[PDB]
Amino acid sequence: DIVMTQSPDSLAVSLGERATINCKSSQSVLYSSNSKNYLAWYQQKPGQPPKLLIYWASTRESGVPDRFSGSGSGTDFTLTISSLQAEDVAVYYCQQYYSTPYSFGQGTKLEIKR
Amino acid sequence: DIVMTQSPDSLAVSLGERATINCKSSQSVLYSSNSKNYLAWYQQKPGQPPKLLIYWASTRESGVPDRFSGSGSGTDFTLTISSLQAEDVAVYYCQQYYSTPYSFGQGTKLEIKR
């Protein structure tokens, strides 16, 4: 079964600073008939549900700021926030939707370094 | 886009009592070539990631207690906990994985009625 490991666990950064989050799948999530990577990134704020940010590794969802870009192929993926804004403080999850269980990574906490 | 509405929002029940959670998709999530319902149920505890419980509406994941069963077809689904145990207190999400965004329901909080 495909399992995900994110790095780092927690990340405190300055306002407007650049933030990156890695996601490693234990196995490739690239579909060969397809050439799409079955990798999605979720943003989760306190007391609300997980919201899709990006699917297919790099396609941004409608209404998601320009400042969020995904990238990667195979087993290695990255989420970049080009400028961390106060509305960006949340927990981010990578999840493979390649095969059951469609596992979430353990999440990365992003807070404003005070 | 397929959107999900769960009922109820919050539910406090006695220990060992039966609990049920409804999930209504705005559109059918039943695949016609397939006859599977692209409906999954997630259990989320505080400060951890969402864990798959059931996929295809009724198939339980390996290692998930007998006390969790899913049911439904089309637009109407239910999660039943046959006897609520102390390790069952969490937030439950239905999510359609039929088309983008693969939306989560707003979640249902299940606590022990004290």
Swiss-Prot record, chains A, B:
Complementarity-determining-3: annotated segments: 95-101
Subcellular location: Secreted; Cell membrane
Region Framework-3: start-end pairs: 63-94
Annotated segments matching region Framework-2: 41-55
Boundaries of every Ig-like domain copy: 1-101
Annotated region described as Complementarity-determining-2, given as residue ranges: 56-62
Segments forming a coiled coil: none
Region (Framework-1): 1-23
BP GO annotations: adaptive immune response; immune response
Chain spans, region Complementarity-determining-1: 24-40
Main localization category: secreted
Disulfide bond sites: 23-94
Gene Ontology terms, MF aspect: antigen binding
Any GO CC annotation of this UniProt entry: plasma membrane
Keywords assigned: Adaptive immunity, Cell membrane, Disulfide bond, Immunity, Immunoglobulin, Immunoglobulin domain, Membrane, Secreted, Signal
Quaternary organization: Immunoglobulins are composed of two identical heavy chains and two identical light chains; disulfide-linked.
Role this protein plays: V segment of the variable domain of immunoglobulins light chain that participates in the antigen recognition. Immunoglobulins, also known as antibodies, are membrane-bound or secreted glycoproteins produced by B lymphocytes. In the recognition phase of humoral immunity, the membrane-bound immunoglobulins serve as receptors which, upon binding of a specific antigen, trigger the clonal expansion and differentiation of B lymphocytes into immunoglobulins-secreting plasma cells.
Protein name, per record: Immunoglobulin kappa variable 4-1
Organism name: Homo sapiens (Human)
Gene: IGKV4-1
